[PDB]
Symmetry: D2
Subunit: 296 residues, 4 copies
Amino acid sequence: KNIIIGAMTALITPFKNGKVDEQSYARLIKRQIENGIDAVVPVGTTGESATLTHEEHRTCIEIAVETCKGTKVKVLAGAGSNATHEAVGLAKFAKEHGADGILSVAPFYNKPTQQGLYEHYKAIAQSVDIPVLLYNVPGRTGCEISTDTIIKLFRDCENIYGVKEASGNIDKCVDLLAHEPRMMLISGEDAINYPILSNGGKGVISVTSNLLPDMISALTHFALDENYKEAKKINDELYNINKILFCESNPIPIKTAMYLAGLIESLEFRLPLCSPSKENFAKIEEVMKKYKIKGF
Amino acid sequence: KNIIIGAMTALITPFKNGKVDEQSYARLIKRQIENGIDAVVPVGTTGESATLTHEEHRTCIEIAVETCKGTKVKVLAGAGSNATHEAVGLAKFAKEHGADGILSVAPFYNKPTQQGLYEHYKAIAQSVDIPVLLYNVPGRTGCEISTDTIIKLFRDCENIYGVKEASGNIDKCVDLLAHEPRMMLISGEDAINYPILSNGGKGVISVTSNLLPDMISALTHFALDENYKEAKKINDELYNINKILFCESNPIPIKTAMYLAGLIESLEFRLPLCSPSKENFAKIEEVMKKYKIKGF
Amino acid sequence: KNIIIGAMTALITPFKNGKVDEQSYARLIKRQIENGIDAVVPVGTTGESATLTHEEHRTCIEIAVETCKGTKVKVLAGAGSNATHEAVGLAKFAKEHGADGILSVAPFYNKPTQQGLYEHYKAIAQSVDIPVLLYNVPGRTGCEISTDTIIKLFRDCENIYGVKEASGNIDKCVDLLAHEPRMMLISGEDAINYPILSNGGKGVISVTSNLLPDMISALTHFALDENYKEAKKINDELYNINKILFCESNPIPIKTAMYLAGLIESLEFRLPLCSPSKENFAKIEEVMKKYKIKGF
Amino acid sequence: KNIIIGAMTALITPFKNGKVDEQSYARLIKRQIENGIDAVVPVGTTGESATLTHEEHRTCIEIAVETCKGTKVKVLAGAGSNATHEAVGLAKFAKEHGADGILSVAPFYNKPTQQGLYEHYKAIAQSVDIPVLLYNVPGRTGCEISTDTIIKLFRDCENIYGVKEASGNIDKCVDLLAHEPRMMLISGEDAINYPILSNGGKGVISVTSNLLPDMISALTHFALDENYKEAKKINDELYNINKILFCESNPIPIKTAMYLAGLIESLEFRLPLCSPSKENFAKIEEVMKKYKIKGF
Ligand SMILES: [Mg+2]
Ligand SMILES: [Mg+2]
């Protein structure tokens, strides 16, 4: 199977005067490349995919594809939806635009069954011939992709190569890699990046890496090289920022942190997302003081 | 405040050959009207709102509005989204089409904070001049509209007149009506229709009423007339079907039941929703046999 | 079946200088009787059963039995355990000491299966010839008595006449009384006292009644007399104190309130129970303010 | 600090004719010693502590101490309670009987606060001069020992040296060892033995090791020697038996498995524990077929 693994960043989407700040976006992606990131994830959850228009969806993928050309950095585009017909369209959309692969979140709100999840992803995988990474995050979607369903999709659809787990469930990560050790388990939960990698996970799709890409990059590759003491030390070091970056719903804290570090121009969200509380704004500001944040 | 209360039905959306069975849709609404229902809710969760096109959304609202024209039956149209700018558009859209009001689900997946939920619904309420009913279903959305946020929105916005609760939390229903007794609490969970009504709830948005509209309407009206013994008696009789209609994710069982009862011609869903398992197919069929199902 | 229903109080156990204040205990029980209570529950959870000696267990049961002589108030003694042989011993112990019935909590910590729970209660029920009330509180025990197991015990065991439910699950309360309407459902959660009674529950085992016995008694008796409007008015008025009495684990807040109202002499617990935070002490004091607290 | 770490077994307590089979108990302990186990845990949860008499508690402890004399195997005695005064007595009781340390479960059922948990364990730690390992298992106790409380207890009481975690929460295990790397994190969940060890945990208190002590011992010591690839291979292979051993509440499955392998004579529990269902009996028998089970 063709795969996209290693240290990866779920890109935030900076807004300026309510529109996508394109200059910014490209500059942020180049900053990721220059700090050892292996792939970037445009218009994912952290990029506020829910509140972007389809044309802004096209714009950010194209910018990501164009910025990583000539580099080893891959573009893993967010291309999921809770209606299979649209998810297939967004996948073909993502491929047509040069994405190296797609991250396709489990259908949200409408709670498909495991049989439905299988047919959903089976349709997406047969739509394009680029790698497909499943994304399981039940706290947001209301559904869970079972280990059996993930394994069946991995074995039945050739371009489905793994799953990004955001479920706080190291039991499930043992289950997945013990029964199907060929799949690429991807950490979608920054605080537990190292434990997932230490059990055979092959990368992270990180929120923290927006702010500290060099540290998330070093952690991942230490782990992939089985230097577990070095990876665990960074994982331990980063725990405080990993937790405070979810003081409020992601991506509210990470965008607040990026603004505090002068990496984005304005702290703008699209409703129903909003700026954090003032207590949290200060809490985020206090944790950042203990880390070294790379510039441009 | 202008309100829409009483026995209400979250209408299923029948498909035939992948298209909205428009004639069936109209016939199903007439069956609701003739069995004492007070309002119908087109293109809600039970209507597979997530997988309908915006023009199919329009068609079902228009069919619902005209089918109830000349009757007292009201149309509470589904018009929610997790992107505020889209939720405002669907609200004005629903008004334009003749809806008496809108049911607006809490933003799903992107987990807005309480501040964001407040701004989300305040933008929606200021979009139109028709009643707005909040819809709290945390198991689907990943977020909760707190009691304080519901009460604040009720007091600040003219058209926000209550909440449809589907959270299995009778405590919160006491919290809501004890601190704001003027609001319209609406049951969105058929099994506990009577306990919510007996505490001062003023209606139901029902899944079971698709199959048994006369039973759900009588239950609601017994309750509103303070004949709690008769409303509880129907609620107790309905428990078995109320539960089995969620053996799998709603609306997979209710559509199965409508097809088994010969009320729709084909048991078609739009992916990622699919037919139920064969064991649950048998369970729905067996529970249905103990209830009298009205024809057309 | 012989039953013990109505307004009932889970009695706190006052300590003075590390010993049971037996005269304060007596004063408290007499205060309960004179405010319309139908039964008292000595050495339950609210009475810190876990940290009392078996000899102090006897003292409090006997004091309760002696204090209720000449009145209609029954003694439903706490006599449960997670070891079946001990729970049977405590049951015979309770009868031998004059209790009218026993409240028997579901085995805690060791998580028996449904088959094990049935055999547990079947052994207890055959040990004595006084009424036995099941107590389901999964947040404390780690186990749940399923509706089927409760029903089986009610139908198979003569002294098992109902269940005290403290599970925040109004669905289960419908489930129970719809399939076995002859059983006595007793609310063990003060905040949802009225909805449980309105669904056919026949009493409450209350924490709040320690502080506000007249209000809990009136609520219950209005409800039993089918005066649902008055029962709901009291339930809504009590919501604030009903919630704050669980700001920390019961009985920490209720004892703090009993001390604040001058009803007990010392704010003493037995470890691992301790005084509340200084903020929760403050909140309890504020909330307490809004209610008229009967003296002796 | 003096510590007890490595591969450890939560010993089952075999019964024959309702009596502790003391002679099988000794035979089972010697089997653990001879298969590389570093410490044994008498009268814990897996040992059905709740249903043993205090005289059987002392008897099983003395057998454990006597069998491990002249060997490197330590006895970490179960000596916990939800009443601090009894837990202090049980601690003294354990020292008196020769135990090398105690495993002391968080108070169950009565849900003490963090402040109460602190004073509870501080009294126990100051009760004796032998190592104390905290035991956090919220699914059984109803309470959680927070990271802050564990850390405070570790720093303030010299004989408290770590915590056995049974909470399925790899985030918390990162939290613990990132903020206090000197403590001994011990796995209390067999399926995730490797991830806990790979993050710096120094041992396991295992259920599976009852049946496969050689495999659990090799797992732990591959891990302690940083041969993580070999430790992960054993963990992955044990996953199926690790999960099936909790098909029903522990220790019902492990005793069923021990009985199926001919390692104990009678499939006897003390109520409320009981034999498993016949479907789970068949499931346990089927998963066992894939492992080499060492005899006597
Ligand atoms: Mg290298
Ligand atoms: Mg192996």
